[PDB]
Symmetry: C2
Subunit: 217 residues, 2 copies
């Protein structure tokens, strides 16, 4: 067996999703930078595996893939017998029950939380003005999603059931930025069940590893 | 039979229906009249906690989110209908899945904003953001520029066979071409135009278009 290849910077939320999945699945990997300032995202050989010139990309001995969620589904299937065996289920019913929340994250939680972090953390870093109109509508949307999560997480320990799965994992990247790079952490802590869930999943050793990697590179 | 909740005119509902037709799975449509707030009934929220459509029920499970429903159907009924719709092995499945994600992350948001602003907003006449329109038309054009390159090297997005990757584009694509003045986004592009001709010509999709009529 050979370490898989992950293309992109660990600071990327989509890259981070792949990295924490590989750690949870106990899969060795190498991270290969894709530096836009060196035109690396536009190289023909990169575009063959990532047609959008975005990150992450993935390669192993069998295939090249793009989009973080499809990379992670592939990884979870290929290495099903390894690491966290239930991460994306152990049968088609479990997989689907997990997947619906993965889709919910990509369609609702992700876009609203993403925009919030953008304005609140990164505009000030660049010393440019925020769009309060952007702040507001996405806080409402995210509020509604989190009210739904609060109810679900009072009836179930994790989103898809009684154990940590990809459903929860997939919330880590945007959730981390929201809680640790903005002052909107209270959206989680003010909600008793969501707060517990966030503390539980963000304290996993896999996720903690990803956090460190952002400092070294 | 399996139950699909919601109106055929919905893009997310349509995604599930055309998949069921491609997979030769019989189904029953259970209406959800959102104009009557039926999507917020306590019993419906039990199977669709976001109060959205579609929802899906069969003998073993209840699911929400159209793409998750469709992945479930394609696996459960892998030996029915179009057997290659989501691949016949793990490599084929992933190669299709990456373009399904491209649709949901890149094509979907912008084409979806345009479908709303131009095809849905005039009914219940809402002032259109010109604005949200301008931005998303440019975003969609960029995505279709990528598709134009890809579809010059491949008959369909994931390979030379029609798959769920292509299918997932039908709902938003059809409203743009047939219910807005933005059809040129697909026809101004040579390879995307051919691709659109092929996927929109499938009998499964044409059935969905008809099911909207006989509501």
């Amino acid at each position: 067996a050979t370490p898989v290849k992950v293309y992109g910077p660990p600071l990327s939320t989509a890259v981070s999703r792949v990295l924490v999945t590989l750690l949870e699945k106990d899969v060795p990997f190498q991270i290969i930078p894709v530096d836009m300032s060196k035109g690396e995202h536009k190289k023909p050989d990169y575009l063959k595996i990532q047609p959008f010139g975005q990150v992450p990309a993935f390669q192993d001995e069998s295939i090249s893939l793009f989009e973080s969620r499809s990379i992670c589904r592939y990884v979870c299937e290929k290495y099903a017998d390894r690491g966290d065996k239930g991460l994306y289920g152990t049968n088609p019913l479990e997989r689907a029950s997990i997947d619906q929340w993965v889709e919910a994250e990509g369609q609702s939680f992700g876009p609203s939380s993403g925009a919030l972090v953008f304005q609140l953390a990164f505009a000030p870093r660049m010393n440019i003005p925020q769009d309060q109109g952007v702040i507001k509508q996405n806080e409402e949307k995210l509020g509604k999603v989190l009210d739904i999560y609060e109810q679900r997480l009072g009836e179930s320990r994790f989103l898809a059931g009684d154990e940590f799965t990809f459903a929860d994992l997939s919330h880590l990247p945007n959730g981390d930025y929201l809680v640790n790079a903005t002052d909107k952490g209270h959206l989680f802590t003010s909600r008793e069940n969501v707060g517990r869930w966030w503390n539980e999943i963000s304290d996993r050793e896999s996720w903690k590893k990803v956090i460190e990697m952002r400092k070294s590179g």
